[PDB]
Structure formats: structure tokens, C-alpha cells
Symmetry: D2
Subunit: 115 residues, 4 copies
């Protein structure tokens, strides 16, 4: 698990369950090609998106469908989705956790990058 | 205005209006003495808490009554309040904005510190 | 001023000054068309991006160039930028403030939406 | 583990390691009595603070010594510490994770409350 995504709900104080997540890698023509996707688990987590062989250096975009998550809960959301765009850098063995904390009109995201 | 408090609502996408704020200052005997208090306005801002003369070096606690705020909107929030504790003016007088972004089970706070 | 962007620095406790901001609008062919751009001022605010006439219903993307900002301070940040994507004015014209609080490996964003 | 504390570093993108955490419970005279404490692990986590028998309903304060954490890294911090004050409510079996994401002039905290 070179790449994990974790999503939390700031309104209900819970994991954000069954949230669609799409990962894209930037191509040479500078467009976003699908790379991996899934739905978050009961623990708000999404594992097994990629493997260390496939997860090469490059720019990646993690898109979290926050709008559908809120809509299914009956709450009026602001954002179309939440997007996290970052460079994967090989300099040193790294595991990446992309965490997002969601509110209807706000979100915050952080990266936890470890050996 | 050496100390201003700004409060936003992350559920409604609006200023957080009518939020009670209490400020304390740590006294010599190490207890929290009441220093100033007020209510955020329609813009979510609380001005006029203190003056440059009164706002001396010290350790201050800004306690924002988040629970009352959420309860009136029908939500039973996690936190009793949000408190922000910091040393002020120890390198000379500064202007401090204490900003908070509120959700029922979460909040964020940041400080903007400027030199007049 | 129907659209304003405000950017704060969580490491320095200050406005984030000289941050490039690019705004796009989703066109009919579903591509992102350049809509407006600018630089945050000394107060971390970016005013004057658009007008009530120009700022029609649509899906907008506000892209904040966080990486350039951190790089100039010597920090190699995690994110390429912060992007904020939202439908605007679909219930009539509103005023939008897009606020962001920046750290090298993290950021938060919130929207304040008011009705004039 | 009825109560867990997790602390992350937003500047370095890592767990906040070896951070002192103090938990207090509010007493009848409305003063804060020490309840539990520890230092965060290598994963920025602090487990085993209490047990379900001891963790009764009441108001608790979690104090995170953020100032010492930043000082030991050579970074000038704003806050004296970060404090999280909440009511533990029995209505339903609950596990509490108090998470905090730290910057030198800012922090955010959320509660993840699950069965
Ligand atoms: B939590 O991660 C968080 C707290 C606070 C803010 C916003 C602060 C703000 C917004 C508009 C104006 C001012 B001011 O200096 O008058 C401050 C965010 Cl985005 C996130
Ligand atoms: B502030 O706006 C903020 C606070 C906390 C988080 C996420 C915390 C987290 C990350 C990974 C795992 C767990 B856990 O419950 O084991 C919690 C963010 Cl993104 C932002």
C-alpha cells in the first residue's frame, strides 16, 4: 500500500463511508488519465489503489466525490468534489496517506508521508 | 484593535453570528482571570475586546462557545467550546486576529499576527 | 465584488501574500475555460476578479498556486496547488469568498456565501 | 481503547511523534483533575489512556503540548498548547478518537466517534 486515502466526516464525527475516489496520473500531453479508483470502506479508508511497481514518480490527482456523499445524506454541499494534486517523489522509500476532513462548505486535507 | 476574533460556519458557509467569546488572562497566582468578553456580529467578527494600553504581555485564553452556537441550530456538537491559548505581546505589541472555522464535530483555528 | 479569494499562512501566522490565483469556468464542451486571474495583496486578499454581469451561473474552479508560494520561502510542499471547484449562482447571484489556510503538507478551504 | 489520541504534523507531513498529551476530567467543584497521560508513538498515536470501566460520562479535556513539540523542532509556535474539551455521552456504545492536525500558528481537531 504505497497510497492510501482516508476520508472523515466533520458534521457527524465519523468515517465518511462509501465515498467514491478517483486517482489520475498526469500524462505527457498534460491531461489526466485514470489510474485507480474505489469507494471508501466502513472505516472511511481506501486501500490497494496501486502497488509500488506501478506507483512511479509523477503528478497525481486524487478526486473525492464529496458532492454525492453529502447529497445522499440530505445536506446541501458547496464543492463539486475535493481534489488533491501532488507529486510523488522517489527520493527515499515513501508511503502516502491522503486524508480529507469534510464539511458541507469546507474541507481540509493533509498528507502523511512515512517510510 | 489589538485583539479581534473571527468565527465562520463550515456547515452553512456563512459567518458564525452571535457566538459568545470569553477572554481570560493568566494571573500571577497562575489562575485564569476574566479579561474581556463579547458576541460575534453579523459578519462573524468581534471587535473592541480591549485596547493597546490594557492588552499587556501575558498568556491569554480565548474561549469560543461553540456548543451554544450549534445547539441553537439543532445540532448536538462534540465540543464544549473551542479554546485558544497563547502568549501575547512578548516581543512588543502586536495585533492579533484569532479565527475559527466551526463544524459540529470539528474545528480549526489560526492566528494572524501583525506588527503595527 | 461577487468573487473574492483570501489566503492565510499557517506557518507564519500571516496573510499569504503574492499568491497566484487562476479561475476557470466549465464551458459547454465540458472543458475548463480561463475565466479570471490575479495575485493576493498584502492582506492576502484578491479582489476585482470579476463583475456581477460577467459572473454568470456555471461551474467554477479556483486554483491557488500554493507550490510557488512555499517554494519561495524555501519549503518543498506536498501539493501542486489547491483547487476549489463549485457551482455558482444557480439560485441567483451570490457573493462568494473562497478562503484557504495553507501549510506545507496540508491546507483547508472554506466558502462564505452571502446574498446581496 | 475507549479513547485514542492521534496527532499529525502539517508542516512536515508526518505523525507528530513524542508529543505529551494530558487528559483531565471535570470534577464537581468544576476544576480539572488529571485522568490519564502519555506521549504519542512513532505513528503519532496514543493508546491505552483509559478503559471502558473508568471512562464514564462526564466532561473531559485533552491537552496536547504542541508548544514543546514545535520548540524541539526549532519552529516558533503560537499556541501554549491545544486543548480539546468534550462530553463523553453513554447513549450508545462509543469509541473516541481525538485527532489533531498541527501547524505553528494553527491547528484543527476532529472527533471520530464509532461503535
Ligand atoms: B481551519 O483549518 C481554518 C480556520 C480559519 C479559516 C479562515 C480564516 C479567515 C477567513 C476570512 C477572513 C479572515 B481575516 O483575517 O479577517 C480569516 C480557514 Cl480557511 C480554515
Ligand atoms: B483539521 O482541519 C484536520 C484534522 C484531522 C484530519 C485527519 C486526521 C486523521 C488522519 C488519519 C487517520 C486518522 B484515524 O482516526 O486513525 C485520523 C484532517 Cl485531514 C484535518
Amino acid at each position: 500500500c504505497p497510497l492510501m486515502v482516508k476520508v472523515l466526516d466533520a458534521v457527524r464525527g465519523s468515517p465518511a463511508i462509501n465515498v467514491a475516489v478517483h486517482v489520475f496520473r498526469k500524462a505527457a500531453d498534460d491531461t489526466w488519465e485514470p489510474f485507480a479508483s474505489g469507494k471508501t470502506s466502513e472505516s472511511g479508508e481506501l486501500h490497494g489503489l496501486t502497488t509500488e511497481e506501478e506507483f512511479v514518480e509523477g503528478i497525481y490527482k486524487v478526486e473525492i466525490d464529496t458532492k454525492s456523499y453529502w447529497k445522499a445524506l440530505g445536506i446541501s454541499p458547496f464543492h463539486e468534489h475535493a481534489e488533491v494534486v501532488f507529486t510523488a517523489n522517489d527520493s527515499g522509500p515513501r508511503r502516502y496517506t491522503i486524508a480529507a476532513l469534510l464539511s458541507p462548505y469546507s474541507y481540509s486535507t493533509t498528507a502523511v508521508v512515512t517510510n
